């Protein structure tokens, strides 16, 4: 197997994560990880038995992107990340590539994987949200919701369903979150990263909210993921346009602004 930047990751684990190496190894190694159905893909999504860590499969492009960003990401960490100053950004524990000739693995095939913390925890999340902040488009999930299980609710759903979105965070807390959001989005903006959303998990009663930025690795890709399926009609909505779409800087401002409303 191949591990990318072993030293940097080790530092990242202790630094932001304050994750003991042994604990990390134990979670992954000791018990076989459980799979989670991912998206439509095609790409594997896994979780450790303890559900502390998520293992995702990444494309060659994404992995390369990680390497490019790693120095900035590290610097950001020092200024502020979870152990440092808490960042919403994903905490990257490690990146590996497994390609094995042996029968179990595809021969001469390369599987790349990224290990990271999981925003939700093992315990439980009553409701989930995936907030892009983007202007209406896929601001809802039709198929999801089908699951009686936890649906990953989207912006429009948040606006209508958890409308007058109840997320009430203390005034003191609002300041801390917003400040950290501003810095993260700024950081991402520098990198030209876009199409990342804020994952929100909610607990009910005196509620506990879980939030963090996700879908970090994607940048400078104008041509990607052409839309599939027929669009529902009858309502005005996304246009045939736009050949001119929102830029990374623009994305950042909108993201924070939208998120601002989410928490009171």
């Amino acid at each position: 197997c191949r591990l990318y930047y072993a030293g940097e990751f080790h530092k990242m684990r202790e630094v932001i994560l304050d994750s003991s190496e042994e604990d990390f190894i134990r979670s992954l190694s000791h018990s076989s990880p459980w799979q989670a159905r991912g998206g439509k893909s095609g790409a594997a999504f896994y979780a450790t038995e303890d559900d502390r860590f998520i293992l995702k499969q990444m494309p060659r492009l994404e992995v390369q992107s990680f390497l490019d960003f790693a120095p900035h990401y590290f610097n950001y960490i020092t200024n502020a990340v979870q152990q440092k100053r808490p960042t919403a950004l994903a905490k990257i524990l490690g990146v590996y590539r497994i390609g094995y000739k042996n029968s179990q693995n595809n021969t001469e095939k390369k599987l790349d994987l990224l290990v990271m913390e999981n925003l939700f925890y093992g315990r439980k999340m009553a409701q989930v949200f995936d907030l892009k902040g983007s202007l209406r488009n896929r601001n809802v999930k039709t198929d999801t919701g089908k699951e009686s299980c936890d649906v990953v609710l989207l912006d429009e759903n948040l606006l209508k369903m958890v409308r007058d979105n109840p997320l009430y965070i203390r005034s003191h807390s609002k300041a801390v979150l917003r400040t950290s959001i501003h810095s993260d989005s700024h950081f991402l903006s520098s990198h030209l990263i876009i199409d990342y959303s804020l994952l929100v998990g909610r607990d009910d009663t005196s509620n506990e909210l879980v939030v963090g930025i996700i879908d970090y690795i994607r940048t400078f890709t104008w041509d990607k993921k052409l839309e599939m399926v027929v669009k529902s009609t009858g309502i005005l909505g996304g246009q045939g346009k736009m050949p001119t779409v929102v830029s990374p800087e623009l994305y950042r401002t909108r993201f924070c602004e939208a998120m601002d409303k989410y928490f009171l």
């Binding site: 007058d164 601002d260 409303k261 009171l264």
Partner: protein, 450 residues
């Protein structure tokens, strides 16, 4: 939620922005009005745009602005509470004004009892905290203060030989000058005949002045001392570099406008008025011994100021501190014309002041015939007080209606006693920064829903 929990002190983007904004126009609790405005702008926002394309701007937020006018005025009409008096006698502490503030407090109360403005509209205006200054002289020992219901300055007359003391003075006030003003064709040549055109400017203006017959003459802008002579020979006294603040102030206290191109005023209503300008002199070393001008009987009595004294600096400003403690308690007590019977006993008949007034009178449209029809839906928001307290113990619509019936004896439901009480003695009710919470919303709310 936390807004129905409003018989106690113990606690939409644009909306809450402006919420904080006016929240430190005057400091109070954010969430109460956040949630009220939430609900009521919710029905509103449902009016304008997404469906129904309503005409959502005129004649309804109009009605809310009217609601808030009636809100301020009438809700400041119903105090019977065993008021601050004990609180304040307790407030006595914190400095050396012992034995000699009481005059101060009694007579600030007097002057702020002078005040019941009804100025701008069908509105019992209150420009509290806007309309007076009081002043001292550091000298001697303090306790000789003497009040006067009017201004007193140290702003000497334009010509020490002008009025040693004026009486019943009319004046002419203009932010502009008595100096040949900006005519269209800006032209400057032949110095002598143009200073003579200035002379004629001045003198025909003086014709028109004495045609007005002022008594004092005062510009914000300037004058040519030519006109000064023209009127001191007429005896219409004058003042210099005249402060615009009290100019507008008292001109409005007067009937005197400031018609700005008096080619406009072929007639009177520019002349101001007051009672009398009168000096008083001091005589000793240490140049405190100045001369200062009483200016009393200004055409509005909602204003006073006092001769005060003192032989130091720090205790004097510390008495200033007691005086601003009085500032604060004054306007606090003032938002109520100073409290309201708590435990939802005054508030039933209060929210219903519109109800029973505009019902018994009927003569009821002051709210609206929609306050008959739509007045079942939304002013129910003013009907939150009961929906807060009663439905916990006693009566949801019932005391509401039967107490907008008009008993006038406002004891009410015993949430926590089962017999008789009010939060007043239970010392459990949000103090009164909260009132203005209803008059700010609509001005800022009618635009964001274009």
């Amino acid at each position: 939620s936390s807004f129905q929990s409003t018989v106690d002190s113990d606690s939409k983007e644009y909306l809450i922005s402006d919420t904080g904004g006016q929240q430190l126009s005057i400091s109070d609790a954010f969430i109460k009005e956040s949630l009220f405005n939430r609900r009521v702008e919710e029905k509103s926002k449902e009016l304008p745009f997404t469906p129904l394309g309503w005409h959502h701007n005129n004649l309804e937020l109009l009605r809310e602005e009217n609601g808030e006018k009636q809100a301020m005025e009438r809700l400041l009409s119903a105090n019977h509470n065993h008021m601050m008096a004990l609180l304040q006698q307790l407030l006595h502490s914190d400095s050396l004004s012992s034995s000699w503030r009481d005059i101060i407090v009694s007579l600030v109360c007097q002057v702020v009892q002078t005040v019941r403005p009804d100025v701008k509209n069908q509105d019992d205006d209150m420009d509290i905290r806007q309309f007076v200054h009081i002043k001292k002289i550091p000298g001697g020992k303090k306790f000789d203060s003497v009040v006067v219901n009017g201004f007193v300055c140290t702003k000497n007359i334009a010509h020490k030989k002008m009025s040693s003391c004026i009486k019943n003075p009319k004046i002419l006030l203009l932010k502009c000058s008595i100096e040949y003003l900006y005519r269209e064709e800006t032209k400057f040549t032949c110095i002598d005949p143009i200073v003579l055109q200035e002379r004629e400017f001045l003198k025909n203006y003086v014709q028109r002045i004495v045609d007005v017959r002022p008594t004092l003459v005062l510009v914000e802008k300037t004058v040519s001392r030519i006109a000064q002579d023209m009127l001191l020979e007429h005896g219409i006294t004058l003042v210099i570099n005249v402060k615009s603040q009290v100019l507008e102030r008292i001109s409005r206290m007067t009937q005197g406008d400031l018609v700005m191109s008096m080619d406009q005023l072929l007639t009177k209503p520019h002349l101001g008025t007051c009672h009398k300008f009168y000096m008083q002199i001091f005589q000793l070393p240490n140049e405190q011994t100045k001369t200062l001008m009483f200016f009393e009987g200004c055409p509005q009595h909602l204003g006073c100021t006092i001769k005060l004294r003192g032989g130091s600096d720090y205790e004097l400003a510390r008495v200033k501190e007691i005086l601003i403690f009085m500032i604060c308690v004054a306007y606090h007590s003032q938002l109520e014309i100073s409290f309201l019977m708590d435990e939802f006993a005054m508030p039933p008949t209060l929210m219903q002041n519109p109800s029973f007034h505009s019902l018994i009178e009927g003569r009821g449209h002051e709210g609206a015939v929609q306050e008959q029809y739509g007045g079942g839906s939304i002013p129910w928001d003013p009907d939150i007080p009961p929906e807060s307290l009663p439905c916990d113990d006693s009566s949801l619509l019932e005391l509401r209606i039967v107490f907008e019936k008009g008993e006038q004896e406002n004891k009410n439901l015993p949430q926590a006693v089962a017999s008789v009480k009010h939060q007043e003695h239970s010392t459990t009710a949000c103090p009164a920064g909260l009132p203005c919470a209803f008059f700010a919303p609509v001005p800022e709310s009618l635009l964001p829903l274009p």
